Structures are given as C-alpha cells and as structure tokens.
Design an enzyme around this catalytic site. Sequence first.
Site, short mmCIF file in Angstrom:
data_model
loop_
_atom_site.label_atom_id
_atom_site.label_comp_id
_atom_site.label_asym_id
_atom_site.label_seq_id
_atom_site.Cartn_x
_atom_site.Cartn_y
_atom_site.Cartn_z
N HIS A 44 0.82 -1.23 0.00
CA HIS A 44 0.00 0.00 0.00
C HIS A 44 0.84 1.27 0.00
CE1 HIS A 44 -0.22 0.17 4.59
NE2 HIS A 44 -0.03 1.44 4.29
N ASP A 84 -1.25 -7.31 1.23
CA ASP A 84 -0.63 -5.99 1.40
C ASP A 84 0.89 -6.12 1.44
OD1 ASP A 84 0.02 -3.27 1.86
OD2 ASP A 84 -1.26 -3.07 3.60
N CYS A 172 4.39 2.15 9.76
CA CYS A 172 4.14 0.98 8.90
C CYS A 172 5.47 0.39 8.42
CB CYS A 172 3.33 1.39 7.67
SG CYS A 172 1.58 1.55 8.01
#
Length: 212
Positions: A44, A84, A172
């Site tokens: 992402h 992802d 992330c």
Amino acid sequence: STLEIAGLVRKNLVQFGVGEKNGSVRWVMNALGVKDDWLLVPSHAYKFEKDYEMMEFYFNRGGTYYSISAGNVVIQSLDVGFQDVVLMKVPTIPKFRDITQHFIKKGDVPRALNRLATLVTTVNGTPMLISEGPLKMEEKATYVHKKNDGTTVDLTVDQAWRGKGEGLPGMCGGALVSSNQSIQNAILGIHVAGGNSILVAKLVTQEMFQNI
Ligand SMILES: *C[C@H](NC(=O)OCc1ccccc1)C(=O)O
C-alpha cells in the site's frame, strides 16, 4: 530476548521512499530486509498511486541512499490474494543479514496469542519500541489507506495480529516481535495499520519465505 531480536530488526529496517525521476523523494514508511536483496514492505506504500512503475523507489539505509526504477524491483506475493505486505527484490541494495529464521513458524502461531508484543519500528529512521497489548488474531482485518489525493481505499488482508497500542504515521513496515521467550521472541509480522488505539500487523511466517 525481545531487546536482542529488536536490535536485529533495527539493523535491517530501511526507509522506503517514492519519487518521480529527477523529483523530490517522499519518504513513506519502513521496509524490512529479510535475506539477500529481499525486503518485506507493505505494497500500500506505492501500488495505489498512478503509474507507480514509472516512479523511482528509494531505500535509505542509515543515511546511505539506494534508488532503483520501480519497474526494476521484483515483487513476490506471500500467499494467494491481497496480503498488502509483499516480498521485494532490490538489486541495488546491499545484502542483508538473513533474519528469516527469527520469524514465527506457522505451527507456533497460537503460542503468541494472548501475550504482549513489541512493535520494532521507526518514524523516518528514528528507532522506536512500541508496546502492544495481549495479541489477538483476526482471520480478516480491514483498514483504511489514505492516498496522496485525499481519496481513500479499504484494504482487507488474511491473518492479521491485533494489539492495543499507540502508533504514529510512518510506523508501517516495522516488525512485530513476541514477548514469548519460549518461541525465542519470534518476529510475528509487519505493521500495516494503527488507529483507535489498535495496532494491526500482517502475519508473516517462516514458511512464507519459501515463495523465494
Ligand atoms: C538471528 C539469527 N539466528 C538464526 O538464524 O538462528 C538459527 C539457529 C540458531 C541456533 C540453532 C539452530 C538454528 C542469526 O543471525 O544467526
């Protein structure tokens, strides 16, 4: 110990950035080197913007910057469907210490449930250890990704850890590490979302590296 696993993760974390050729780099999140020139990174970070393959990808390794055309990295899935996090081969990156054997085995997953964990990450390269409450496993987790143009996308992955904790933008791509010493404080997966005091990490198992 958690702290020693954390040190190994720390040394393999790089900053992941995206730019147009001859343009400014936007630093997006972390990526984690796992073995050779392969990294784990949440896709992402790049896949939802226009013409991603025409962009340059940047890897900041402790203030030494490595870049490559996005069309020249090799992306491998962890499993069928959207997960992802992907495996990404970056030919221009210096070889990483192999940390694959520190990841949890699929069969040992239950041993990390209902126990504390630590998210080992950075914000823009500054290392942080973030405590996560006793972990649960979600068979399907959904989270919202905000694109550069403000529009949003709902992402759903299979098998994601959920733990109480406080995350920040940029975290992330960091690695979730179990507090459980009896499975050698195994790396459990990769942080993909945070909000409402909930931290979400995609499960990554030792077996998934067999995808090469
Ligand atoms: C953190 C790494 N450890 C590792 O790969 O362990 C594999 C092992 C260790 C002891 C007995 C059997 C297998 C490392 O960098 O070495």
